[PDB]
Amino acid sequence: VVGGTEAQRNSWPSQISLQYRSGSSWAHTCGGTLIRQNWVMTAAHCVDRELTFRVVVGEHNLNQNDGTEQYVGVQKIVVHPYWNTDDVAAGYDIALLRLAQSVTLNSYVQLGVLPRAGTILANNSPCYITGWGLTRTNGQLAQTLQQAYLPTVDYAICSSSSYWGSTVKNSMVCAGGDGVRSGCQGDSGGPLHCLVNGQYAVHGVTSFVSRLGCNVTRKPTVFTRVSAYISWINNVIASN
C-alpha cells in the first residue's frame, strides 16, 4: 500500500497473509480475505504458480510473532476456470483456498462480510485497501499491515480513455487514481473494504496496477469485483 498508514492492530480481522515456502523459510506473497473458517478468497494470479502455501490469520507484524496469529496450510486451490494467467485484463482474477484446518474465530480473526450478488457502488464511494505490499513503487514490503483510503472510480469513468480504457471490464472495481495512494505488489489478493450502510464489506480483490508504477494518476488500482462472483463463490464452497 502506497500512501497509507499503519492499521490499528487487528482492526481488519478478516485480512490474511498468503505465504509460500522458500527452502526452510516462509515469505509473504499476497493478501486474502477469510470468508469461512476454512476458506480464503484471494486472486487467481497469486496462486497459479506451483508453490507450497500457507495462510496466516490474525497477523499484524510480518516479522514478529504477536501471539494473535494462527498458521494453517492450504488443502485445495480453486482458481476460477476462466482465469488466464497471460491476460489479467480479461478478468476472472479470483481463487478460493480451502484451508487444512478450520481457524478459531476471535477478536483478531473474523470472517469478512461479502456484498450481495450484483451490488454496485456509486462513484467516489468510501473504501480502504489493506495489505503488506510495497509502500512505494519498486520499494519494500511493509512490516506492519497498512491501510489507505481509496474511493471508488465507477466503471464508466474508469473505462474511459482518460483512465484505463478497455483494459477494465465491468467485472472489476477501480479505486484511487489520485497519484498518491494505491495498492502495490504484495497487496494483490487482499481486500478493498467499502462502507455500505455503516458496515464494511469486501467489495474487491486486489488484481493489478499500471506497468508504470503503483500510484499513477488516473490509473486507479484495479480489483476483481466480488459482487460479480457471489454465485461462483457459493457454488465452490457448496461443492468442495
Residues placed in the known binding site for Ca(2+)? 59, 61, 64, 69
Q: Is 6 in the site for Ca ion (CB under 5 A)?
A: no
What count of residues does the chain have? 240
Could you tell me the CA-to-CA distances from 50 to 20, 31, 176 in Å, in that order? 10, 17, 32
* Least distance to Ca ion, CB of residue 202, Å: 22
From CA 149, how far away is CA 147, in angstroms rounded? 7
- Binds Ca ion by CB under 5 A, chosen from 37, 61, 144, 160: 61
Q: Is 231 a catalytic residue?
A: no
The stretch among 58-66, 91-99, 207-215, 221-229 that binds Ca ion (CB under 5 A) is: 58-66
Q: How far is CA 8 from CA 13, 14, 36, 52, 145, in A?
A: 10, 14, 23, 30, 8
Angle ∠(122,17,177) on CA atoms, nearest 5: 35
End-to-end CA distance of the chain: 33
Selected catalytic residue, list 28, 45, 60, 80: 45
Q: Residue ranges of the alpha helices (H) in the chain? A: 155-158, 230-239
Residue nearest to Ca ion (CB): 66
Is 80 catalytic? The answer is no
Smallest gap, in angstroms, from Cβ of residue 63 to Ca ion? 7
**Is-catalytic flag, 166?**
no
How far apart are alpha carbons 198 and 185 in whole angstroms? Answer: 29
User: What is the per-residue binding string for Ca ion in 65-104, x denoting contact by CB under 5 A?
Assistant: -x--------------------------------------
Q: Answer left, alpha or beta for residue 142, where phi above 0 means left and psi between -120 and 50 means alpha.
A: beta
Q: By rule CB under 5 A, what count of residues binds Ca ion? A: 2
Per-position x/- string for 16-45, each x denoting binding to Ca ion as judged by CB under 5 A, each - no binding? ------------------------------
Question: What residues make contact with Ca ion under the rule CB under 5 A?
Answer: 61, 66
- Active-site positions? 45, 93, 188
